[PDB]
Amino acid sequence: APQQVILNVMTSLPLQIIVETVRGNSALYSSQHFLAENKEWETHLIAWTGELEDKSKIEKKLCDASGTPNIHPVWLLRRDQGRWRKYAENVLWPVFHYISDGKAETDAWHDYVKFNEAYLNKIKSVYKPGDIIWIHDYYLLLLPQLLRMEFPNAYIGFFLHVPFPSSEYFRCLSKRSQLLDGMLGADKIGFQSDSFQRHFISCCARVLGCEVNRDSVSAYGTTISVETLPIGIDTEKIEHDAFSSELGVEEKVQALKQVYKGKKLIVGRDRLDKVRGVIQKLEGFEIFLDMYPEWRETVVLIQVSSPGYSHSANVETRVTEIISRINSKYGNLNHTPVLHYQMRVAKEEYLALLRVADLALITSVRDGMNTTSLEFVICQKYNNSPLILSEFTGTATVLKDAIMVNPWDSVGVAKTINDALMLSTKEKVSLESKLYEKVLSNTVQNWTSTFICDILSHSI
Template sequence: MVSKPAALDVEPAGSDYGQYDFIVVSNRLPVDRVTDDGEDTSWRRSPGGLVTALAPVMAKTDGAWIGWPGSADEVLDPFDHDDMRLVPIPLSQDDVELYYEGFSNATLWPLYHDVIAPPEFHRAWWECYKQVNQRFADATAKVAATGAVVWVQDYQLQLVPKLLREQRPDLKIGFFNHIPFPPLEIFAQLPWRRQVIEGLLGADLVGFQRPSDSSNFLRCVRRFSGHAIKSQHVNIKTETGTRICRAGAFPISIDVDQINELANRPDVIERARQIREELGNPKTVLLGVDRLDYTKGIGHRIKAYGELLEDERVTVEDAALIQVASPSRERVESYRLLREEIEASVGRINGTFDTLSNTAIRYLHHSYPKEEMVALYLAADVMLVTALRDGMNLVAKEYVASRTGVNGALVLSEFAGAADHLKQAILVNPHDIDGLKDAIMRAIHISPGEATRRMRTMRRQILQNDVEQWSQSFLRALQVDPAEELGEQP
C-alpha cells in the first residue's frame, strides 16, 4: 500500500510525450481507499475482475491506469501501487451528479438495457459528459508514450477514443463495452447518437460481450455515420487516407483460480455448512446474488418464489431463498424506489410464510467479501440468475467455478450474455413467471446424474476461458493489422 501520493514526472528528457507503453482508462481507479483511525489514507486493490485481468499486463509492461479515485472534489497527484502508475482524474460534485449519476446511469444505462426503465435526456448532462470525457482524454494523451496501447473501458467514456485520437494519432486505441449495446431502434432515441458513434469509432478495435451487441453497433454505424462497412470493419476516411475500426465480441470471464482456491479452503467450506444451519437446514437452498438494479430481475425472481409458496409447490422447510442485493446508486430515484418495492415484497412473503424455525427469504442488503460469496455459492443447491438484460453476468460463472463437487443447478436468463456460454444451464425467460416457476422446480428436483452432466460441461467451458484469456484475446486482436486481415478474407 501507498500511504500518500507521489509526484508524477511523465515527461522524459527529449520527448514530447509521456513514458507509459500500456494504459487502461476507466471511470474508476483499480484501488479502494483505506483509512485507519484517522491515519493517512492508503489504498487496497479493488476485487473486480477487470483489475485481476489487467494487473499481470501492467506488471509486465510500463503501465498506467487512469480513473476517478471515488470521492468528489478531491484532487490527487498520480502515485504508484502494485506495479501500476495510477493517474487520478478529479470529479466535482456537479460532475458526479451530471456525468455519472445523470448521463451515464440515468441516460445511457437504461437506454442500453432495453429501456427497462425510461431513460432521461438532458442537455446539461450531455455537456458535462463531454467535458469529463475530454478530461480523461487529455490526461491519457499526456502520459502515453509514442505508439502506446490504450484500452478504454465502458459506457462512461464512449467519447474518449475519438478525443484521444485527435490529439495522439500515433496510439493504438481499444475500447470495451461491458454492458449490452442496444438495437438500432432503441439507440436511435439518443439525441446525441451520432456523436457517441463517432466517439467509439476513434478506436482501432471496439469490443462487446456478445456477437449481437457487435451487430447492433455496426447497424448503428451504418445508419448514423455514413462510413462504409465490410464484414466487421468500418472504413473511416480521414485527411491522410482511410483508417479502419473493427468491432467484435470478446466475452469477459472470471478469475477461475481464485474461486477454485476459495472453494477448497476448509474455513470457506465450514462457513457454507454454517449458512445452511442458520437457515434451519432446508432441503434446498436457492440463491440470488445481484447488485440492486432494475435490470437484474430480482422482483421477478421473488414473485416466482412467492407464488410457488402460495401454490404449495414448495414450503419454507423445503426451499429457502437467500437474496443478496448489494447497494447501488442509492442517490438515483429509480434505484431508491426499486429498493422499497423489493423490500416490501420480501416483507409480505416472509410475513405470510415464515415459521419459528424457517424464514422464506433471507434478504441481505449488503456487499460481502469474496470469501463469504464463495461460501454462499457452496451452500446453494440452486443459483437463480434472472436478469432482464445483462452484458454478461459473472455471478453465474462464479457459481459454476465454485462447484468443485460438480453438483448444483443454475437457472439462467437467456437475456444474460453468460447464456451464450453456459448452455447447459436451465435457461429461462424471466418475464414468463409461470415458466420461471417451472424452471425453479426443475432445478430443485434435478437428478444427481443430470446435475453432474450439466455442471461438468459448464465448468469445462469456464476453466478454458478465464479472465486472463479474455484480456489476452482482446489485446492480441488489437495488434492485428486490419488491412492484412481484410486481405485474407475471400
Template structure:
C-alpha cells in the same frame, strides 16, 4: 507529452478506493466490482497504468503506484458526479442501453458534463501512454474518449470494450447525441462487445446514422475527404473471471467450513436457492421474488425445506429509481415471509449488504441452485463465479436468456424471466434435477470457464490490438 506506460487501461473507476485522513495522508484499498476483478490481474501481469476516478468527489490525488499498477486518478467535482455519472451515464445511457426498462432522461446539461469529463479522461490517458502505446478504454461512461484520444495521440493503438449491452438502432436513435457517440467510438481501432447481438446492433447503428461504410464486421471510417479510410474492427469478446483463483479460494477449508455454517444457520434446508446482484432494476430481482412467491403459493415448495437467499448489494443509492426499487423489493420480501414463513424459518432471506469475496465463495458453495434472472445483462460474472465455486459439482445454474452468459454457458438451464409460469417450471427442474445430471452439466460448465478465463479474454483483445498496430506499422 507522452508517459512511460506501454499499456494503459482507462475506466470510470480506479481499481482502488482512495482515502485521505485529517493529516492529508493517503491510503487505499482494493475496490469491489466486476471490471476491477476482471482487469486487475491482467494489468498487474503487464505492469500497466490505469486511468480512472477515485470514487470520491473533489479528491485531487497525484498519480501513484499501487496494487501492482501505476494509478492515474482523474478528479471529478461534486457537480461532475451529479451530471456526468449519476446523470448522463446512469440516468440516460444505462436505461437506454438496457432496453428502456425504465425511461431514460435527456438533459443537455448532463451531455455537456459527459463531454467535458470524457475530455479530461482522454487528456490523462494521453499523458500516461508511452510513444506507440496500447490504450484500452472501458465501458459506456467513456464513449467519447477513443476519438478524443486519437486527436491528442495519433501514435497510440486504441481499443474500446462495452461491458453492458448495446441497444438496437431503433432504441439508440432516441439519443439526441447519437452521432457524436458513434463518432467517439469509431476513434478506436478495435471495438468489443459481450455478445453478437450487441455488435450487430452497433454495426446497424453505424450504417444508418453515419456516412461510414460497413463491410462484414469492419467499419471503414472516412476521416476527411481525400484522406484514406481507417479500418475499425468490431468483435465479440465475452468477458470472464479469474477462474483459477476463485476455484482455489472455494477449496479452502475456511470457505468449506463457512458454507456448512451458512446452511446450518438457515436450518439446513433441503434446497438453498441463491440470488446475488447489485440492487438494480435490470437484474430481475422483483421477477425472482415473484417466482419464489408463486411457488410457495402453489405449494410446489415450502419453508423451511426450501429457502431463497437474496444478496442485493447497495447501488447508486442517490438515484431515485434505485431508492424506489429498494422499497419495492423490501416490501415484497416482507409480504412473502409474512404469508409463508414457518416459525423461526423464513422462505426468503434478504441481505442488502456487500460481502467480502470469501463470504461470497462460501455462499456459492452452500447453494444448491443459483438464480440469475436479469432482464438485460452484458455478461453476468456472478454466474461464472458460482460455477468456479462449485468444486463439489452439485449446484445447478439457472440463467436468464437475456444475459451474455446464456450464450456462453450452454449447460445452464435457460429461462425467460418475463414468463413467470415457464420460469417456475425451470426452477422446479433445477430443484428436482438428478445428481448425475447435475454433475455432468457442472463439469462441462467448469471446463468452459476454466478454459475461457479472464486472461484468455484479455489475450484475445490484446492480440487483435497487436494485429492493428502491426498493420499500421507496415
C-alpha cells in the same frame, strides 16, 4: 500467456478514497491485475475517482500507492460530484438497457465532455509513442476519436462491458452521432454478445453514413474491426479462495450447512435494478411456493443486493413488497423463505454462500455479462448444484448447456426451479462438468490476452 514482441482506461479506480472498491468490476479488475503483474510489458492505469493542498492529492496518492504503481488518476473538484455520473447513468445506461425528466441534461452533457477531456488530457500527459491503448465502457465513449484525432496512428481498442442498444433505442440520444463518432476511433471494438455487435454495426450504418459489413465498420477511409469477446473470470483465484483452508471459507460453509440443515438453499447476488431482474426472480419464487406444497417450509431464498443509483428506489420498493408478501404468506417464526441482505458481505462469506447453494438463479432482464453465474459454477465443481439462467443474460451466450428460463414467465420459472431441485445426481454432475470446463475455457487472463492480440492483429 500474453504474447511477447499497455494502458488500461476505466471509469473509476479500483479503490475509493476513504478503500477497496467492491464496485463490481471484478472480472474487469481481475484483468487489470493480470496486466499489473505482467513482466513482458508493465501496465499503466488511467481512471478517475469521485469520493467521500494539491500535494495533499499526493497524500491520497501516498497510499493509493500500492499499484504497479504510478497509477494515473483524474480529478474533478466540484460539489455535486455525482454530476460526473449523471449523463452516463441517467441517459446512456437506461437507453443501452432499453429503459427521470431532467432539463439539465445539457449540463450533464457538458460534464460528460469535461470528464472525457480530462481523461484525454492525462493520457497525453503520460503517453509514449507506440503504446497500446485499452478503454472500457460508456463513460469513455467519446474518447477514442479524441485520441485518434490527437494521434493519427495509435493502436486503440475499445471494449463495451454493457449492452449496446438497437438503432431504434440509440436514435433517441441527442448526441447520438457524437457518441457513435467517438466510438469509431478505436481500431478494434469489442462486445460481450453477438446482438450488441450487430446493433452497433446497424447504428453506425443508420445514424452515420459509414459503410458496414458483418465484422467491419468502415469510415474515414479507414477500417474498424468489431468483435464478440465475452469476458471471463479469474478462475484460478476464485477456485483457490473458494476451496483454500487458509482463508476460512470452509468453516463458514459448514456453519451455513449447520444453520440451514434440512433445507434447500437458493443463493444469488445482484444489484437492485430494473435489468438485474430481482423482481422476476421473486415473482417466480412466489409462484413456485404457490404451486408446490412439498417445497414449502424447506426452501430458503437468499438474496444479497447492491444499491442502485436512482429510479431503482421503486425497484427497491417493489422487490421489498414482494419479499414481505412471500414471507408473510409462507414464513413462520422458525422459517423465513426470503432472506434479503443489503449490506456489503465479505468475499469469503460470498464464496461460502455460493458453495453451500443448492441452486443458483439468474433472472437478468438485460446485461453484458453475469459474473455471479460463472463464479457459482466454479464454486459448485465438487458439489454440483444446478444453475438456472435467463435467456436474456449475456452469459446464456457462453453457457449454452445450462438450464434456461424466460424470467418474465414466472410460472415457467417455478416449473424450472422444481425441475432443477429434483434433478438426478448424474444429471447434476454431468451438467456441472459441462458448464465447469466451459467456464474454464475462457479465463479472464486468456480473454485479456486474446483481445490484446486482436487489437494488434487488426492494427496492421
